[PDB]
RNA sequence: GCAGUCAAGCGUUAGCGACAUUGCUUUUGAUUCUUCGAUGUCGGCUCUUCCUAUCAUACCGAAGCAGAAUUCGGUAAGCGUUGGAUUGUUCACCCACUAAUAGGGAGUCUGGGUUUAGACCGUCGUGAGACAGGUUAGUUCCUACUGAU
RNA sequence: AGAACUGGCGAUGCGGGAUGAACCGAACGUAGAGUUAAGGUGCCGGAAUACACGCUCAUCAGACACACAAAAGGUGUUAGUUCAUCUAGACAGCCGGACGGUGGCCAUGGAAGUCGGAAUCCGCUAAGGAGUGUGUAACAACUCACCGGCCGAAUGAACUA
């Protein structure tokens, strides 16, 4: 889905997630088995727990895999925005090892199922359950750092803009401290901090306003320093590829005063080497 | 010990009956032929019949004058390099054979009980191979006479591994590489601590790149250029030991530097970042290269090779003056460096991402070629010393060979079965000898890349190999606390 | 079990010779439908396997950089790296990811219980 | 939506006056609660609690020593660096696995009263040429389930462990006709193609194959493990 | 699990060993289209009774919980936990609606089947004979509770 | 699993162990007197709701074929070992110092100690960490590591039962 994926359900660590799993099996399964019951009823219920705490990992893993975004072919903006802000790269590695993880504890469950309905004694399906145990543990307990990246990135997320580039937006842009997040804050029944200082509004803040009978919304973004294109920060890369990307004319802004100590000359420069963006 | 099938009744029924005969004196097919240099020049035709191939070396030789031999190559799908003639309009080309043939290595030698402790490094003296000098876990390095197979003075004065340790290129001062923190001299004969161990460096030392001999001006004895964990470069003055300018642009370990023909130091970094660092720009970067995925693991260039000869060619006659030897050197230089007309020594840059990058720091950043087709990280990459060639070791078992200019794939050896470290080149550019973490040593023959011969005996982890400049002798030593030594 | 000479002995070593042989059958081996196989033979196939298939898979990043590293309070990622260099060839590789992207641009009864094959151990 | 303004509503709100109190009060309270919890948490959980105590006690204990040691102020080449890294057998005198239940007996026909049927309960390996012959004559049955082809396999060197294909078994004890059977009975000896590995004896003539011994008992583990006879 | 690693402590006091720790443990959300000889009678209807290792309702608690809504630790058995579906076995999966449609034991009217009925196809044998399958036919007031004199 | 060896039941009554075919005692005719083994002396249950040294708060303690879920853990209790603080003022409580080069060096829009990371210096003293935390765009703002102003006599740390 689009327009603030925050539903995702915000996972706990994977010892947290592999704790609450281990009680919810032990909870909703049968724990009184005795050597004196036939072999074939253990045997079930062996095969069921084990079935069971199989069936609920596969169904963490897979609501987990269907809550994100789908940054694949989502959009080429809300694509490099997702990129910059938490390197499209390593998530999408860390996509990949959650969904080889989970063929892995599926592959597990299988075999150990498979396994499960040939032993004899009750000490030896005992012990095949805690090894299947003791194997899906394993092959969480890698995922740690994965799942609390993950979960980063999802606070991060949630909290993310939420706009349409194909509908109808003007956005306002130019030097840092210039007044910019003053005229957004004014312009817009929006709430933004108007501070003095070169990174008030670090994050995209989305304003809306009414206008002609018809909506009209807005971004905001500190701007661009020099920049030669090869030395860009996240923030400022950010205001780039929303630059590209976006729609009709964003309004650049250029403090012609004292403040904003950059010669005038810098700034009709900056612009000029933005050009192509025009 | 597992038996190859045996030949059926069918086979040996086939191989019963005699078949054709190689005399071929008779009815000698006639073809139109064209020649054209290798490199840039294009080209006396004639149509010729199956003649023999000395016969046609020879015609060429009257056509520019020199008398020089040419090796010879046509269709460069074919990919052919009277036997030949008779596979058929057939291109011909021609490049110097360089007649000093490196006889290959095949017969073992007798172990050295020396310093006992497994070895990190080793390198031929370019005045001549009846001398050589390894390095090991223990704090001092040894010389051996290659002649007698013995060991030489003992380098007393360090007091931890000596990482790297290598002639000069005039052969007059060894340096080695002390692991924590220094550096010291050592001239062939001194069999001490030559004045006080270069020191005040805060990590341990990662290679050595010594100042080319075509370069050093008559008189002055050649800089030393030192990389370390700390990711700085210094440059020593080998008379006065002192350091006139530091580089600590690389944010991380230097992996290796190299210094090249034109006086700019190329070296990799961990910070997957490539720095030209320069002497005449008074130690400061004139270009930076980033394109490797992971960190840069080896650097090396088309004209490496030249430097580290230092005038001494195959024959190993020693210059009477430094200016004389000078104008050896930068003669040489020019040779291998101005193959293709202009002098443009090539780079090439190790990742370890199975890819290597193929670079020109002489021209435009962007680069030349993406050489990638490894599986594992490349260990070692070594310019050929002809320079039409390039190879590579890999922890993937295999050993991969690559056009020395347009960057196309050659071919891949496979002989080794475990993790393939660094590697040596023939004097001849003809045979390549290997060495791997297999208690195995191999060379392979690059006319027709099939494996020449085998040369175990090693205990095992033989880390690294050596080839004599002259060629007589190949050294090799691995963690056995043992050097073994192989000749032809 | 009792000690010998026995097992700690070699046993099954190949000769060095043999596997560039094997190597060459292996790439020259081919079969027809009429041609079926009755005993495969027991070969270190690994060895004669991985031919020259140079694909070189993409780079192991999270080596260069952890997760933790990427994206979080502790984060070391100030700035992209591989970044476009210019504007101009940014702008133009935006334009037509746009493109392409546009390019690209209650229910009736659930299945039948009779489906149970092939399901249904 | 909205990225981290609240934040900036903390900021221009402050910390409600009770916050801080309440934080202060709870944290000052935080071992009294601990202290009862003791107490508290009984079976299934009081267990743990003492184990997630003692975990954090030798935590406590080795990052203080840590501490302590810092107060108080195998040569590898240069590109290994930086890298991570009395013939008798290794377990002698096995379990004796008796000649019992093991052969597990299933009753066939309508009327059970001809069984004569045998099944072995134990994890075998027999490769391609297994060919199940017909069902009449399945004097013994090794369920397909309970056969593996690849074992785990390790040795005193690096402490890698790559799974590698099963090539044979040469000398099962206690009556080797389970060696006959294929039958794995941890204690076996069995040939692994250790190729992976690529150790080459001396003469040059690499190594692909070596007999390694079953340590762990696939009869009650899902993964058969061994050790390399180096 | 195996083989180590650090080593709180016990040590013949050279060895052990709690907790952590490395290698099995398609890096690009690809699709494995995999679901591998359970030889045993149980399976499903209704109602009651008991447990909490509790699904909803109830209780309060920790969360990038701003709301809607969502993730989870704990108290709590008071009241609820419905309806269709296969059989070419139902050792089980699908989806109507609800806030949820929680897990078990104490067996106790109905249908497979657990057994000699009689027969058949193929297996096996010189044959009686029985099966690696399988189909047809089937029959199994004494005491305690609820009302009254 | 297996061997030799000892006792009881086997073939067995009697007191106690709620009761147990293997437990403790115990030499089995019919009665009387007095002393005991085993169990006890709040009632069933015949005998002190006897003396004396201490422990035990337990949400079902404890009186349990002694067998192991049993290793630690409790800001729960009682008693002991070792090492230092000491009237050159014992621990804990209220107040100030917490410097100067310095805003270290490389990373760079900000890392002034508390987003990255190598050592952590020298000047300086009663004492100062290129920093323990709380919090800031940037210091800034507050605490202790460590010291002093008042107090005012034993205190802190690791182990054992
Ligand atoms: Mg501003």
Redesign the pocket.
Request: net charge positive; charged share 30%.
């Given at each position: 889905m689009q327009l603030?994926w925050?539903?995702?359900?915000?996972?706990?660590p994977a010892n947290?997630l592999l704790?609450?799993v281990l009680?919810?099996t032990?909870?909703?399964?049968?724990?009184?088995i005795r050597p004196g019951f036939?072999?074939?009823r253990i045997?079930?219920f062996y095969?069921?727990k084990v079935?069971y705490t199989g069936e609920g990992f596969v169904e963490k893993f897979e609501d987990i895999?269907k809550g994100?975004?789908?940054?694949?072919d989502?959009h080429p903006f809300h694509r490099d925005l997702m990129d910059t802000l938490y390197e499209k790269?390593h998530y999408?590695?860390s996509?990949?090892?959650?969904?080889?993880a989970?063929?892995?504890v599926?592959?597990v469950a299988?075999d150990y199922?498979?396994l499960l309905?040939?032993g004899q004694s009750l000490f030896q399906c005992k012990q095949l359950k805690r090894?299947a145990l003791?194997?899906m543990a394993?092959?969480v307990?890698?995922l740690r750092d994965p799942l609390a990246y993950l979960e980063q990135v999802?606070?991060?997320i949630?909290?993310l803009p939420s706009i349409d580039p194909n509908t109808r937006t003007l956005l306002i842009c130019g030097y840092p401290n210039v007044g910019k997040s003053s005229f957004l804050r004014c312009i817009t029944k929006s709430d933004v901090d108007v501070?003095?200082?070169?990174?008030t509004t670090?994050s995209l803040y989305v304003g809306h306003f009414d206008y002609k009978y018809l909506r009209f919304q807005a971004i905001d973004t500190p701007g661009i320093?020099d920049r030669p294109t090869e030395?860009m920060?996240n923030?400022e890369m950010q205001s780039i590829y929303a630059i590209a990307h976006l729609r009709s004319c964003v309004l650049y802004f250029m403090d012609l005063s004292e403040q904003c100590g950059f010669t005038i000359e810098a700034q009709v420069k900056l612009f000029h080497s933005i050009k192509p963006l025009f | 010990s597992t038996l190859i099938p045996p030949p059926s009744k069918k086979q040996k029924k086939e191989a019963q009956l005699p078949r054709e005969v190689a005399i071929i004196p008779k009815d000698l097919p006639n073809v139109s032929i064209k020649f054209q240099a290798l490199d840039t020049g294009d080209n006396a035709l004639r149509v010729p019949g199956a003649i023999s191939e000395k016969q046609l070396e020879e015609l060429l030789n009257q056509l520019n004058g020199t008398s020089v031999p040419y090796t010879f190559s046509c269709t460069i799908k074919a990919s052919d390099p009277y036997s030949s003639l008779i596979k058929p309009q057939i291109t011909l080309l021609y490049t110097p054979r360089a007649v000093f043939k490196v006889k290959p290595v095949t017969r073992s030698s007798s172990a050295i009980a020396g310093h006992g402790s497994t070895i990190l490094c080793s390198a031929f003296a370019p005045h001549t191979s009846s001398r050589m000098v390894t390095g090991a876990g223990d704090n001092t390095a040894r010389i051996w006479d290659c002649d007698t197979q013995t060991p030489m003075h003992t380098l007393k004065g360090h007091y931890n591994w000596v990482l790297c340790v290598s002639w000069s290129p005039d052969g007059e001062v060894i340096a080695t590489g002390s692991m924590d923190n220094t550096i010291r001299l050592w001239d062939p004969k001194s069999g001490q601590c030559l004045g006080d161990a270069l020191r005040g460096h805060?990590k341990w030392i990662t290679s050595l790149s010594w100042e080319p001999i075509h370069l050093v001006k008559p008189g002055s004895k050649p800089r030393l250029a030192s990389s370390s964990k700390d990711?700085t470069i210094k440059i020593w003055d080998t008379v006065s030991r002192v350091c006139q300018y530091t580089m600590?642009?690389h944010?991380n370990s230097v992996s290796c530097v190299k210094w090249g023909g034109q006086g700019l130091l190329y070296s990799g970094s961990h910070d997957r970042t490539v720095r030209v660092w320069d002497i005449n720009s008074q130690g400061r970067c004139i270009n930076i290269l980033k394109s490797h995925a992971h960190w840069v693991n080896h650097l090396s260039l088309s004209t490496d090779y030249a430097l580290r000869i230092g005038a001494f060619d195959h024959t190993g006659k020693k210059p009477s003056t430094p200016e004389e030897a000078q104008k050896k050197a930068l003669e040489n230089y020019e040779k291998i460096c101005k193959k293709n007309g202009n002098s443009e020594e090539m780079m090439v840059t190790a990742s370890d991402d199975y890819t290597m990058f193929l670079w020109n720091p002489l021209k435009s950043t962007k680069p030349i070629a993406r050489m990638t087709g490894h599986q594992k990280l490349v260990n070692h990459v070594a310019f050929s010393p002809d320079g039409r060639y390039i190879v590579s070791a890999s922890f993937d078992n295999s050993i991969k060979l690559w056009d020395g200019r347009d960057g196309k794939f050659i071919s891949t050896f496979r002989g080794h079965v475990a993790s393939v470290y660094q590697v040596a080149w023939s004097s001849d550019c003809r045979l390549l000898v290997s060495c791997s973490k297999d208690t195995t040593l191999k060379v392979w023959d690059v006319r027709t890349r099939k494996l020449s011969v085998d040369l175990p005996g090693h205990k095992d982890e033989v880390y690294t190999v050596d080839w004599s400049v002259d060629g007589k002798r190949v050294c090799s030593g691995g963690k056995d606390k043992m050097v073994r030594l192989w000749t032809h | 079990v009792q000690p010998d000479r026995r097992w700690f002995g070699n046993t099954r070593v190949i000769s060095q010779d043999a596997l560039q042989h094997f190597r060459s059958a292996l790439g020259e081996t081919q079969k027809d439908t009429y041609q079926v196989l009755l005993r495969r033979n027991k070969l270190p196939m690994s060895l004669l396997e991985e031919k020259d298939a140079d694909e070189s898979?993409?780079?192991?990043?999270?080596?260069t950089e952890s997760y933790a590293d990427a994206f979080g309070?502790?984060?070391?990622r100030?700035?992209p790296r591989l970044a476009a260099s210019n504007l101009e060839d940014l702008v133009k590789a935006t334009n037509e990811d746009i493109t392409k992207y546009e390019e690209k641009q209650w229910?009736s009864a659930?299945?039948e219980?009779?489906?149970?094959?092939?399901?249904?151990? | 939506?909205?990225?981290?303004?609240?934040?900036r509503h903390?900021?221009q709100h402050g910390?409600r006056l009770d916050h801080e109190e309440r934080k202060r009060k709870?944290e000052?309270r935080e071992?009294?609660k601990?202290?009862?919890r003791?107490?508290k948490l009984?079976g299934?959980?009081?267990?743990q609690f003492?184990?997630k105590?003692?975990?954090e006690?030798?935590?406590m204990?080795?990052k203080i020593?840590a501490h302590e040691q810092?107060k108080v102020?195998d040569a590898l080449p240069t590109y290994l660096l930086d890298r991570?890294?009395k013939f008798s057998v290794?377990?002698p005198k096995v379990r004796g696995i008796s000649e019992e239940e093991m052969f597990?007996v299933?009753?066939?026909?309508?009327?059970?009263?001809?069984?004569?049927?045998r099944?072995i309960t134990k994890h075998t390996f027999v490769g391609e040429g297994?060919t199940?012959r017909?069902?009449?004559m399945?004097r013994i049955?090794?369920?397909?389930?309970?056969r593996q082809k690849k074992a785990?396999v390790?040795?005193?060197e690096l402490?890698?462990?790559?799974?590698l294909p099963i090539l044979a078994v040469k000398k099962n004890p206690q009556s080797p006709m389970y060696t006959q059977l294929g039958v794995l009975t941890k204690g076996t000896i069995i040939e692994v193609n250790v190729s992976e590995l690529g150790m080459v004896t001396a003469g040059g003539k690499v190594v692909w194959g070596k007999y390694a011994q079953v340590?762990?008992?696939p009869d009650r583990?899902g993964?058969?493990?061994?050790?390399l006879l180096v």
């Open positions: 603030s925050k539903d995702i359900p915000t996972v706990a947290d704790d609450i009680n919810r032990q909870r909703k399964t049968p724990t009184v036939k072999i074939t045997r079930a095969m069921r079935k895999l994100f975004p789908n940054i694949n989502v790269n999408k590695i996509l990949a090892a959650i969904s080889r989970k063929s892995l599926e592959q299988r199922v498979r309905k040939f090894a003791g194997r394993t092959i307990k890698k999802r606070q991060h949630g909290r501070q003095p200082y070169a990174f670090k320093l030395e920060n923030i | 805060s990711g600590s642009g944010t | 898979p993409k780079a192991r990043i999270l080596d309070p502790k984060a070391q100030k700035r229910t659930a299945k219980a009779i489906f149970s094959k092939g399901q249904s151990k | 939506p909205q990225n981290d303004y609240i934040e903390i900021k910390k709870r000052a071992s009294h601990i202290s009862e003791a107490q009984t299934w959980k009081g267990k003492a184990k105590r003692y975990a006690k030798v935590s204990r080795k020593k810092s102020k991570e890294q290794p377990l597990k299933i009753k066939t026909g309508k009327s059970r009263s001809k069984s004569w049927k099944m297994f199940r017909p069902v009449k399945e049955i090794r369920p397909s389930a309970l785990n390790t040795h005193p402490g890698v462990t790559v799974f340590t762990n008992e583990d993964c058969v493990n061994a050790v």
